[PDB]
Amino acid sequence: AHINLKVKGQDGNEVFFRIKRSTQLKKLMNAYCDRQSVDFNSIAFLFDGRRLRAEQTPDELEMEDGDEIDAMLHQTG
Amino acid sequence: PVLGPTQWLGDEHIQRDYELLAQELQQNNPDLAARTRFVDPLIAQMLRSPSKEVAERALGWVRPGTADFLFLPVSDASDTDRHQRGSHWSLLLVDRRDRGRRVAYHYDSTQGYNDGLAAELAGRLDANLQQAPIRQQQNSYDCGVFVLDGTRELVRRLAARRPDLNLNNLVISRQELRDRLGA
């Protein structure tokens, strides 16, 4: 019922999470930004080359234990 | 995403137009689409990450081995500083056709501005950096539009097998981009 995931930052920093596969990734994203003291709206999360949406769940994305999510700050120019 | 008339483009605007372009190319010229990569600007930055595993993950996502052409939007956003989110966009086209002489053409509407990042990305894609001509910007907010319209013009030229990829004659249209994003 549970899945362990790592969030990997652009500088290589890693944070580990354990969550239910039926739960929205919003909870992991909210917790990562909260813990990193960054605005949720300034961060994008990527998995398998695609931007993740907060409303998607791990089961929806076929995530398996040990999967990594890459967190990147948004860019402007 | 919403884009204003003089708003600086964010990665979300670039990525959305690249998504539309990829689907357009898949429908009109699937053989060129299969050999071309429109790299998400965030993934392009991952490719220059100081973290080797981040850069390698991004490389796998791009799968450059089976590609003849890579289009990379180049942001100058910081990898290590949360407040420096970028000032400028440029375009790197990697031509991998001669699998022994890979060339990375760097189109920058402010000539020279992003050359250091372009060189780092070209090296990480095993390619030699070549500055390539593009019409120079005459305002401080349209660099992202040059990147997107430059990409679209280059794709047309590649599909047509045109030899000259000089973009000094490029015509930009922010309005047409805003139309595409709003559709």
Residue numbers in the entry:
A (entry chain D): 15 to 91
B (entry chain A): 829 to 1011
Publication text:
Structural predictions indicate that the 1017 residue full-length protein of the Bradyrhizobium NopD symbiotic effector consists of a long N-terminal extension, which based on the Alphafold-2 model is formed by a combination of disordered regions and small helical globular domains, followed by a globular C-terminal protease domain with homology with the CE clan of cysteine proteases. The active site catalytic triad seems already formed in the absence of SUMO or ubiquitin substrate, as inferred by the distances between the catalytic triad residues (Cys971, His916 and Asp936) between our complex structures with the AlphaFold-2 model, suggesting that NopD might be active in the absence of a UbL substrate, as initially observed in human SENP233, and does not require any substrate-induced activation mechanism.
The final electron density maps show the covalent bond formed between the SUMO or ubiquitin C-terminal glycine and the NopD active site Cys971, confirming the specificity of the catalytic reaction between NopD with SUMO2-PA or ubiquitin-PA substrates. Several conserved contacts are observed despite the low-identity of the C-terminal tails of AtSUMO2 (-MLHQTGG) and ubiquitin (-VLRLRGG). In particular by the electrostatic interaction of AtSUMO2 His88 with NopD Asp839, which cannot be established by the equivalent Glu or Gln in the human counterparts, and by the hydrophobic interaction of AtSUMO2 Leu87 with the “Loop insert” pocket.
